[PDB]
Ligand binder design. Structure first.
Ligand code: URI
Length: 251
């Protein structure tokens, strides 16, 4: 229902993406959905070519469900938080199923913005045949914030930022070394996103600057050779996205 459940279909063009071994620039369709209903809030998206990648973020209110104002300090509410990533891949081989679960919260900064924090433990299933499949591996700290800027060009300009800090993974330790000498993978990783979004009644535009540090836990500069000659991984650095979409809702 339009009241709480918000949907959108978008077209996305990316440039200098860094989640994998080699840089990528892709375009694709995307389904988005956000929701907030007393005991549960949710965000997620599914991406598909010009096979299927989806990431959901469902959280459940410990307060609401426990029916016990756990409020404290700047912490308005507490949640059983989840960040689950699924990549179907072209082979049941090169696919991924990642489940982050933990404690989350909403901070009240007394400023005209929203700020949330979450820490998760993770269990890995498929991971493109990597060394850390099927086992509990690594942790993640997710910090995201929403800040309404102003009205611009007839629409509402706002800013969105969120970052995913990953550490404690055993990958990298358990992976080989590169032609390069240094290790191929990484025990940790950071993916920070900065978004400038223009929203009209239905259509919306967003520019996204994203910075990676050992993207996809690929140790930056690792020298590999996939059968076309040697090359160097560029997992640390910037990349960006352009997103145009349409949000549905009956008047
Ligand atoms: O953890 C993630 C999150 C996003 N993406 C890529 O970035 C696109 C949009 O975020 C997704 O379709 C996916 O390919 C990843 O590779 N890994």
């Amino acid at each position: 229902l339009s009241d709480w459940w918000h949907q959108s279909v978008n077209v996305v063009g990316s440039y200098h993406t860094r989640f994998g071994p080699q840089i990528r620039n892709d375009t694709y369709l995307e389904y988005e959905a956000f929701a907030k209903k007393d005991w549960f809030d949710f965000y997620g998206y599914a991406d598909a070519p010009v096979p299927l990648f989806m990431e959901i973020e469902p959280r459940f209110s410990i307060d609401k469900l426990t029916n016990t104002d756990l409020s404290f300090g700047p912490f308005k509410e507490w949640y059983f938080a989840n960040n689950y990533i699924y990549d179907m891949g072209r082979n049941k081989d090169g696919r991924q199923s990642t489940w982050y679960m933990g404690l989350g919260t909403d901070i009240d900064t007394g400023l005209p913005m929203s700020l949330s924090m979450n820490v998760y433990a993770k269990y890995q299933w498929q991971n493109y045949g990597a060394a850390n499949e099927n086992e509990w591996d690594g942790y993640r700290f997710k910090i995201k914030y929403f800040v309404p800027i102003t009205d611009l060009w007839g629409g509402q300009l706002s800013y969105i930022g969120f970052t995913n800090f990953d550490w404690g993974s055993d990958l990298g330790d358990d992976s080989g070394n590169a032609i390069n000498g240094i290790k191929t993978r990484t025990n940790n990783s950071i993916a920070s996103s900065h978004i400038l979004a223009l929203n009209y009644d239905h259509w919306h535009y967003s520019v996204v600057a994203r910075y990676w540090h050992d993207g996809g836990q690929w140790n930056d500069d690792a020298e590999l050779n996939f059968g076309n000659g040697n090359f160097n991984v560029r997992s640390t650095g910037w990349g960006g996205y352009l997103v145009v979409g349409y949000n549905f809702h009956h008047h």
